[PDB]
Design a protein around this ligand. Structure first.
Ligand SMILES: CC(C)COC(=O)C[C@@H]1C=CS(=O)(=O)C1
Ligand SMILES: CC(C)COC(=O)C[C@@H]1C=CS(=O)(=O)C1
Lengths: 300, 237
């Protein structure tokens, strides 16, 4: 069980850790988060009380280093940093644990929600979508645009998701125009899975990362990416059975975790109605269809 | 974006453009079977591809053999249309290729866009105009060449005959759309108006009769009356 200590909390802020969140008051004696489960990526995220504009946060994996949080009063945000001195970190963390200045990652033993949302998400792939190689952790915020959004403006601060475009030469074989547009299996299986992602695990990892950035930061281009990756599978007539079954589980837990009050803005009616009721896979997503119909019957 | 009444003069500027109308590509007769079920029998169709500035008509005849053994023919017909328009563009020299293609039905947008991916600089546009190009098969010589085709074929007519020697392309298009609107609303009456006077003939190399300027005014008046009448007979006014 690892720990992300905080030097202090000088400004009032709502702090998220994965699907949990808590309020910290201005100069409240808060010194971090303990008991973080090893084996998963995590995200620690922030919304200042005085400016709800800009949710921002950091993806990290405690197996890759000792990470801490310190407020920067010049840039005006909580920054993640890596502490290189292992013995300084062990002594200070312990001191804080002794003074009970840390919140505990509050995982219910029965609860697989975070595993289910991050099953295929790996830090190494996050760091290729979010390029800042001098750090082992990755910063994301509400405003960052994707590579595809920028084609339609600072490249260093972009989300390099895999570009998916259904009306593109990449998606459409010359001479198979109608076939490839109405059945996207060759784009899914040959171009994307065999060619770009190499396997379905990497595809699902990017899909799950896009959803989590949409949900936690309201990142609009991430939501576009999540829906495009769903629609590419649903619009393919030929999808391996294990991928369909896994997608159903992935989407089920995403829909289950979504705040009911953000459904209106995080869910694209056209994609979901198409995917559940018109597409080749309209009858392949039983768990997702059942939770969508019971939780969000308005959208449909 | 969409072509409508507000940007209507754009049709007659010097940027090459084509209208594409697919309403006569897939044509059927519906009939009863011996068992008393219903079935369709396809007849020859055509793509109506028209340069409104010059009067060029690229009439691609769609022979019924293209439908043999195919399913979802109304969907296929849109993609076949887009395939043939793309092939036409590729066949044309660069300086003759259109800068825009305006489809008369919005369902042609995605098929045409996908077939034209190789031409990113050619804009594919819808229109809000309700154009009467479906009535092209009421022009006797066009109907005749379509029905007589025994194989796929492209035929090239000027739909304005020689009118551009005397009038502008705006006026020629207005005349064409009036004639076609009339043929669409009451074909028998429209053809009666056009052919009633035996002394006015259709030249062998033309589609419409050889009216004088004054006779065209009379003809155009009679066509407006027809359209207004039928609009009367229809709604009872
Ligand atoms: C001033 C003291 C009581 C609190 O300062 C800190 O906790 C800063 C340390 C820097 C790296 S670290 O070891 O992760 C934490
Ligand atoms: C297909 C290739 C030869 C291009 O030809 C033309 O464009 C000929 C014009 C088209 C119709 S028209 O008005 O009869 C004269």
């Amino acid at each position: 069980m690892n720990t992300v200590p905080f030097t202090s909390a000088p400004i009032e802020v709502t702090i998220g850790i994965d699907q949990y969140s808590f309020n910290v008051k201005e100069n409240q004696p808060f010194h971090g988060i303990k008991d973080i489960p090893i084996g998963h990526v995590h995200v620690i995220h922030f919304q200042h009380a005085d400016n709800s504009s800009m949710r921002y946060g950091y993806w990290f994996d405690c197996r890759m280093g000792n990470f801490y949080i310190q407020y920067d009063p010049k840039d005006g945000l909580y920054k993640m940093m890596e502490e290189r001195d292992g013995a300084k970190f062990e002594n200070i963390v312990h001191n804080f644990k002794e003074r009970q200045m840390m919140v505990s990652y509050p995982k219910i033993d029965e609860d697989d929600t975070w595993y289910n949302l991050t099953e295929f998400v790996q830090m190494d792939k996050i760091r290729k979508i979010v390029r800042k190689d001098e750090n082992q952790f990755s910063y994301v915020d509400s405003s960052m645009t994707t590579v595809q959004e920028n084609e339609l403006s600072d490249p260093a601060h972009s989300l390099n998701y895999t570009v998916i475009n259904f009306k593109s030469r990449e998606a459409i074989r010359p001479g198979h125009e109608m076939e490839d547009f109405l059945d996207k299996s060759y784009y899914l299986n040959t171009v994307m899975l065999q060619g770009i992602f190499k396997n379905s695990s990497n595809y699902f990892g990017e899909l799950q990362f896009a959803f989590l950035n949409a949900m936690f930061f309201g990142n609009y281009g991430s939501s576009l990416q999540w829906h495009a990756m769903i629609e590419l599978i649903c619009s393919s007539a030929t999808v391996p059975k294990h991928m369909l079954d896994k997608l159903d589980e992935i989407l089920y837990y995403q829909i289950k975790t979504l705040p009911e009050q953000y459904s209106d803005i995080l869910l694209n009616e056209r994609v979901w109605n198409i995917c559940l009721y018109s597409s080749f896979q309209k009858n392949s997503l039983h768990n997702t269809e059942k939770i969508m119909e019971n939780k969000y019957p308005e959208l449909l | 974006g969409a072509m409508n009444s507000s940007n209507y003069a754009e049709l007659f500027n010097n940027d090459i453009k084509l209208f594409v109308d697919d309403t006569n590509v897939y044509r059927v007769t519906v009939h009863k079977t011996f068992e008393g079920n219903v079935a369709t029998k396809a007849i020859n169709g055509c793509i109506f591809t028209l340069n409104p500035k010059t009067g060029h008509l690229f009439l691609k005849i769609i022979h019924t053999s293209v439908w043999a053994g195919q399913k979802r023919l109304s969907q296929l017909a849109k993609w076949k249309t887009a395939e043939e328009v793309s092939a036409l563009v590729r066949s044309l020299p660069k300086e003759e290729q259109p800068k825009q293609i305006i489809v008369t039905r919005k369902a042609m947008l995605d098929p045409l866009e996908v077939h034209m991916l190789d031409f990113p600089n050619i804009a594919i546009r819808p229109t809000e105009l309700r154009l009467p190009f479906s009535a092209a098969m009421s022009i006797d010589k066009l109907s005749d060449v379509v029905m007589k085709a025994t194989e796929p074929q492209m035929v090239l007519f000027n739909i304005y005959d020689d009118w551009l020697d005397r009038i502008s392309s705006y006026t020629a298009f207005s005349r064409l759309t009036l004639l076609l609107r009339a043929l669409k609303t009451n074909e028998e009456s429209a053809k009666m108006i056009l052919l009633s006077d035996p002394t006015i003939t259709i030249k062998s190399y033309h589609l419409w009769p050889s009216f004088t300027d004054e006779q065209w005014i009379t003809i155009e008046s009679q066509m407006r009356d027809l359209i207004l009448t039928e609009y009367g007979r229809k709604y009872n006014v």
